[PDB]
Symmetry: D2
Subunit: 412 residues, 4 copies
């Protein structure tokens, strides 16, 4: 009755749902917003209840087991991206970690797209590699044959437990073909008799502009720190997808103590009331700023924004799995680090930081920050050049952001 998804047959819009879904005000004194349970300690009505509770939590008896504020966030997040279930954690990285800890074992192999968020690559290549997990890279995320080849290469060395992709990629907005990935995992399953669990890091576009569950992806992972929170003021992670898989992640979250805290949960609920509004606004502005960059009167720059990438295969994937371009993109100045540094330092409205998806616009130079630990050769092959600048557009007016970039070109 408080999980109503439709009205007279037509489904409700997400922005409507984020004000009530999963919360019954009259079970909380009529409060129109959910109260914050700033505690993790809930007492039992009896010792018999306490024993009964632990019988169920442990599985000694078949199925109160969720924090009230986390449950509302999880219900609303899964609704936003079309998933059966969701679990929220203390951070994007602890959400990704819980997935790896839930499913990987020594001897396991995983397939990954390239490039991944640096912290994810660190978990795979440093920590889990040392725990006996092998990783195999997809050569070209737009080539289904390359996805299948990576799956076969992984299967040669052990069980392929996970197929973990991140699309669009940072900072070039390169894409992974989700439908092609699903079909390659279907053929793999037909050949080997088991199916790798598919996971998509959906932070850049989701949950509003991309829903991996609509493309057969088993789980999506989010750094709620970015767009969903959207105010650069809370850290949180989320995992959405099929109920049985999310249940294993929830078990790991509880075992490794990775729960999101109640106060941040209250901020997330507040944030989710404007997530539709904020993400569409930021994307509209970023679209305008990108088009202005692509034809600016100062200096020819390459603009790696999804609407400006002309390749046929790219656009076929984009049209099929994305409903907007997000608000994070990069452009490439002529010249190297020196020009990019002078450009960034001339801006007044973009703040120099490595985060993304805030109410304020952010800017950084990946080669000297997010990607400074990668060798210069591997940066160049990944398209991260010394002239590349990444912006994450916020809620400022497009005319002010454009005027800010205009001033930077002149003063550089």
């Amino acid at each position: 009755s408080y999980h109503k998804k439709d009205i007279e047959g037509r489904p409700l819009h997400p922005e409507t749902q984020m004000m009530s879904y999963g919360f019954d005000p009259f079970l909380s004194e009529g409060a129109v917003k959910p109260p914050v349970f700033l505690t993790s300690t809930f007492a039992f009505r009896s010792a018999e209840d306490g024993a009964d509770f632990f019988d169920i939590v442990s599985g000694r008896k078949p199925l109160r087991f969720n924090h009230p504020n986390l449950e509302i966030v999880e219900d609303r997040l899964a609704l936003l991206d079309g998933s059966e279930a969701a679990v929220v954690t203390s951070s994007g990285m602890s959400a990704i970690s819980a997935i790896f800890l839930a499913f990987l074992r020594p001897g396991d192999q995983l397939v990954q797209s390239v490039p991944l968020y640096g912290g994810t690559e660190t978990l795979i290549a440093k920590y889990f590699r040392e725990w006996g997990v092998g990783a195999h890279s997809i050569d070209n995320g737009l080539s289904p044959q390359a996805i299948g080849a990576a799956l076969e290469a992984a299967a040669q060395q052990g069980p392929v437990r996970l197929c973990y992709v991140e699309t669009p990629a940072n900072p070039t907005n390169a894409l992974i073909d989700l439908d092609g990935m699903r079909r390659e995992l279907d053929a793999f399953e037909a050949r080997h008799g088991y199916r790798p669990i598919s996971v998509c890091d959906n932070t850049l576009l989701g949950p509003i502009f991309q829903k991996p569950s609509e493309h057969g992806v088993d789980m999506s992972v989010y750094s709620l720190t970015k767009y969903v929170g959207g105010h650069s003021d809370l850290v949180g992670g989320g995992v959405t997808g099929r109920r049985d898989l999310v249940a294993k992640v929830r078990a790991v979250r509880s075992a490794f103590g990775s729960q999101l805290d109640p106060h941040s949960s209250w901020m997330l609920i507040r944030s989710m009331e404007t997530v539709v509004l904020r993400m569409k606004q930021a994307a509209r502005t970023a679209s305008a700023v990108a088009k202005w960059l692509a034809t600016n009167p100062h200096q020819k720059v390459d603009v790696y924004h999804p609407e400006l990438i002309v390749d046929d295969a790219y656009q076929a994937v984009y049209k099929r799995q994305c409903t907007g371009a997000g608000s994070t993109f990069a452009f490439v100045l002529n010249g190297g680090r020196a020009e990019a540094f002078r450009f960034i330092n001339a801006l007044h409205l973009f703040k120099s930081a490595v985060s993304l998806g805030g109410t304020e616009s952010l800017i950084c130079h990946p080669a000297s920050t997010t990607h400074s630990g990668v060798p210069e050769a591997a940066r160049k092959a990944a398209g991260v050049s010394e002239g590349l600048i990444r912006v994450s557009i916020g809620l400022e007016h497009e005319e002010d952001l454009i005027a800010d970039l205009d001033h930077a070109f002149r003063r550089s």
Copy 2:
């Protein structure tokens, strides 16, 4: 340097300013958002500094340590949003209105008021300050400059006219007060009497985005930040904007009566104001479409008291010159009475039954049995409150869903 109003000469848009104006990250270790000072106790660097501090605060020596850091940011941004010189924020809309009354009224003073006012303001005037010796005089017709002058003259017959307090648009009919005509009548009053009543506008329904009384010579605006500016039906807060010297007297009262906003709510306000432009324009967009749909719905003809649907010539001339949008709170009148209104409201799924307004969620109420049930029938008539009138305050939900909910209500109550 932390108060930049323009870029290469052109002024920055308000939505751009709400992410930086009045805050320098590098005086707070680069934090891109202001830290929260959850304290009101700030130590002195020396006993001499403390003595110097109290010398200045009291006026013993002529002149920001005199403002809480988080309140200062909210006030700078709020004044920027509505074009004012200065602002002071309080614990609530009612304590902001109170501070204005306490700062300027004295025994024997008279005030001019528009009608109807928020119930809480009317209680302050008619119960508390009347007992303290303040007389009030009502404007008969807020669209008539002659009626404004007459109320001012009637007030001046009884004593000094200290305040001219108006509220536009009015709740629940969205009736208007002609702010430019009030300015001209106050100009003529000042020419005749040699003093000028301070003018104040409760700007909660439309401000600060869709109406800026300071652009019309109104001395001060007062706001319930609890409504639109906060916008998420959590924090409670008030704001007063206007001329710096008047705001300073209001600020002095705020300190003496201890009605400062708390820091945690200030941090919530700062967060809210990062989306206030977007939220208010979206809510107004949906309300305009919902109002237009009500006006031609196929179930039953209803009067719709939304500013864009009120055809009177004088009203529209006032609306066009002092408003840039219609807000998102409006009323419509069903045929029949309380019984039909109750069946309509109870059939809705997306509107919550509450008396607040300007939240992210859409709200609905029946004023005759709630907000205006304690007033005599005469006061209901003067506010346009009949038993069939229903007031909605549109939130951020999609207009197609709100319309479907209202369409369903007509069918299930008809």
Copy 3:
């Protein structure tokens, strides 16, 4: 069932009640602490439900929907701490005091006051409410029932005596008002004039743990919860406790003038009250030791205005009768006037130089140039606030560290 005041017939101690009184965990999903309602907007289940609510608010139908959930717990516990029938919390100490003056004063009314008062209170009386037509009359000697009766008589010469407003112990001298004698003087006043002034005690310095004015017939107590009850110099709030009918009138003013405490601060207050007994007794213990060391310090003979060190007979009989501890705020007087007092305060490293009191950290200030610099010099001097006087408010630091800090200040000054 959740307002249980005793166990096996015997009443529960206050520190026990601060962990449960007025809260049923099983009405909140078993949560052992009350959830925070960060909203003031509560919806009705139906349009009829809304009409019924306002029927009750307006008195058309006789009568918790009429209180915020977190403020109600704070108020229940606060009234419990000081033995009052009822309580109402506001945004600040000053808005709580204001609510009292706005609830009861009218043009022409007179009030009786003790001296000295908190500076902010003195400003409300002598500036704002005087301009609204209220006169004030001072008790010359708070230990003298004759002086209390005299002020009441002087007040009635000019108009109705609506309030008898006292603050005991006084800030910063710890001067006392004889509360039992005040009640008896008001009884005799009522016999002569046929009406009784409402008595109010600002109970911030000692309450609610070390003094309960309701046990001495005081009609209302007012608190700056910003001080001891909050105790962490991180929230601002006020409270009024006392007779149910009087608190109800203050509450109506609180709502009409928009002085509600916010929910987040209410949650912090609930958290704070779980240690208010513990914190106030610790600070009081430490202050006794620090005052005793000051009274015999090895550097300079100084007068110490701490309740345990003021030897006067009338003082101690009043103190023993109405106080169960001495608090942690007190003053001492240097010989070197303002110049030496400034050198002393500036040499300290552990006491923070600030005007607040009753925090976890120890505080120090010079009242003649700060807290009481707004009072005319004559009234300041006549109340014992002298240029050499230094006020300390002891926190939770170890007494040996505070003494070492004061010892260093004597040397470096």
Copy 4:
């Protein structure tokens, strides 16, 4: 200057340090308490600053704090000060702190030595999750016997590298002890025989940081559930790891890689909590002694009381006298009537809350065999002294006469 540890030569007491250590008010506008940075995003003053930052963050250039959140840093300085450690890192929970230690040091094939019984959550991490990643565990039979500690180390080394010696003392719920000095000497002898040294880790939640400082006894690292005594108000979740700088640095790197930092708001609550941690832990300990003494002599039923002050054994008391300066406030007592009697007793209480946490302001009670220790097999449970009649209480700040009256009522109704 903001990290001053002494005054005129004598070191400041911990309750004094918890109000100032690691914070300079005049770098925060005189605020007497630290402001809350409710953000993790800190901007660079220049592109060159950003490149320099990552030069250091990656270890390409050494540090010449920009690399710690302001509020977490104050908590970490104060925690390390309280327990005498060189360094500290705080995480989102006790379990994420314990996990970070395991993830920083364990590899497939590694062995660890553990005390018994451990917290149920720790036992699950070892026996389920890290067992499946290839880690073996070996239990110390008698924590008071140095021979038993060395035997466990030798047994572990037969099967692979002994990476960790992980103990929890006093143990939950029996208050059984690990001889920490004897453990250090056994690790010395182990190191002499094998040429490598397991890292020693002590879960110090029940007594620390006030009543036990493992760093004073050669323990390499302590781990805390700050959720219990340090927070102390049953309203925040947090973990802490303290110890040697090089080891904490490796734990900190794991914390960052696995995203388990504590959030800013909980850090601000922790700072507030630590201002009363000495007062609260000493008070709870006083009450616990009085309640335990009353239980040992109650007129209703002879019960065994497992409170450190009531355990008469010579070896136990020598260990306790040497490494503890107090008994904490969590302890157990054993009824005769097994689970059925334990349940009737617990259900009869009015002031103790039936819950599994410990170290709150409210006193708590639970039955470990069916709750906290129900996930460990019954054989391992029974050998660790967790029996069907055992009841665990955690004393809070209530007055002892009220808790005693409450337990008295429970005995009668049973």
